[PDB]
């Protein structure tokens, strides 16, 4: 066994669709990107979707639309990927980190209330492993602190509150109380990066739920303008703002079209693998995050586990013992304050003890659609034997 | 029959290379991007090349490596594409626009000297249509104003002068006094966008000429770090069998090139000398066609320059703004797509809103007023060129009194 962590799942159907684009007159943004956006909108139950070159691009663009900028604050969990936070610093806003709960990755929503100020413009929860956050709660928090809010831009007037922007890089296809991810938070960004559930090798999207206060075409145009240098017998164009360059090509969209056709089948397989893993670890010290709750049906992107009674050293040893057995594994995630970039900005790990405690004993097992049932069986058994073995 | 301005030139060889990447374990950055960077470095005579997802990305990262920022100034010509200027505002620097000469797109190098201040960190000349700028002159200017300069970052100490950063979006393959574009200016960004000479549909690169004061590996690593979220991994974690552990040194960007785009680039680069030759043949046919007429093309062959021949920029003698715009619409009625390179930056809403005023760059405006760009791409047949030549001549004269 040599089990990789997240190989891409690409078949001939994807290759023929890309080849088709390469024989067309449209190799960058064109008809298949528009078609992809249409079909993703239907899938996520949103009116419009903007397809871009990364989820990092989408998330940033969302901030840029809301015109979040210097002196504004944006709240992120301490336990997340660097990308959710980096974009806050790109627009010149100030990140505010919120520690997490004891038995989940989700922010402590009391600490979230306490973190909110008159500067607070946006909250970016992360839908880690595909597991969507407690949005009933999150929407209660922003309504509750709604008098703190003052709208300093066009779109901030439309909402008269903190905008909730979902980092659903892991959560295309997840649902919360039966609704698709993308239709829950005010804005949502998705990732189609090589290692994600749905891939275009590099890509992503921004979308937003139906809301009477948003003209959808106008919002789409605004995203488009910012993604293509601010540009608006037809030679003549103007440039309204010296903007960015993060459009999606029809090469990536071709991949996306086919992935989206195959996607219900990929999800089902990831359900089967997660359920086998779940049975395997029941009764053991290995405690997976739950992909099926009363409110959530996860996309089942990552098999996040934590090992009861493991220290930092013991965890790091377990991972290296897993690789000796031919099992690649990962850690999601170092809390942001462990990272040099965020220490240099004054964030300190001792302020987020729960985030640190989640990270210390966390191990992510392979969860992708090229795993065989026998490989899963092998992972279950080896992980159990290796954990117990890590001993003195 | 209807002639497009810039269709992409893609063959089966490109398609088989992309398919090959799509069957590999590497669909984003991987072995073919590294190989592309290696082969482009050889082609441009530079030690290293960083392949990215746009020339806009490359140009901005060059500025971010030089740590050009708030309170610094960066000089660009008034006659250029918005991308050359936008990246200045992205790093928080202040753009300074310089008007151009009377008979070419190049900046007026006297006005350039006059524009330079103690804040001036970078000059971004544009190699318009593939025509490389007068770099002997440009380097004379920055040496001449070298006492104005004070170095407020690591790489600004390495140079102790204004850094010259070539916008060669149009100029992969162009040469200035026999040297490739990329080896002339201090840094150079290239574009592999769909409509460019060499395409990856979307893409580009940053490179830099050999200079004793630059550790090339260190400069590469710095670009790489900024293109991939600031992520690094130490020697220890890389050696370990499970190499999970990484640090993030700076909350950086996301503009790496995939091996899908690199696959395109590898094949394009093989086919490139042949694409260049064809663009030479088309330009020469056009050149003969317009000789003696009121249609005046920019020259792709000078005593110092052999252009890549990316755009057939022309200006029509004695045409006003209205007459030009009418000529272009008459060209489309005849089935000939055409374009304008470029509206001077100060005509654009974004740059007016930042206080730039068109009346300060009268030569830039005068270049734009009567400029028309004809199709110049490797899907044009000789008969289509013949047709363009004749129609453009007849339509221009038609537009009389
Ligand atoms: C991968 C990832 C992103 C950014 O995705 P890209 O498409 O690579 O920009 C953002 N957030 C999270 C949680 C991720 O895992
Ligand atoms: C197209 C272009 C750019 C930027 O190219 P991308 O690869 O689209 O970022 C920059 N400068 C000039 C002159 C261009 O034509």
Author numbering:
A (entry chain B): 4 to 235, 245 to 404
B (entry chain A): 4 to 404
Show me the paper's own sentences about this structure.
Spr1654 is involved in the early steps of TA precursor synthesis, where the first amino sugar UDP-AATGal is suggested to be synthesized by this aminotransferase, followed by several TA biosynthesis pathway steps. The three-dimensional structures revealed that Spr1654 has a fold characteristic of the type I aminotransferase family. Each Spr1654 subunit can be divided into an N-terminal arm (residues 1–14), a large PLP-binding domain comprising residues 15–276 and a smaller C-terminal domain comprising residues 277–404.
In the crystal structure of the Spr1654/PLP complex, the PLP-binding sites are located at the bottom of deep and wide cavities formed at the interfaces between the subunits. The aromatic ring of PLP sits at the deep end of each cavity. Clear electron density confirms the formation of a covalent bond between PLP and residue Lys199 in Spr1654. Although the quality of the electron density is reduced in subunits C and D, the conformation of Lys199 confirms the presence of the internal aldimine in all subunits. The N1 atom of PLP is positioned at 2.8 and 3.2 Å from the OD1 and OD2 atoms of the conserved residue Asp170. The deprotonated O3′ of PLP is at a hydrogen-bond-forming distance from the side chain of residue His173, which preserves the negative charge of O3′, and stabilizes the protonated internal aldimine of Spr1654. The side chain of residue Tyr84 in Spr1654 forms van der Waals contact with the pyridine ring of PLP.
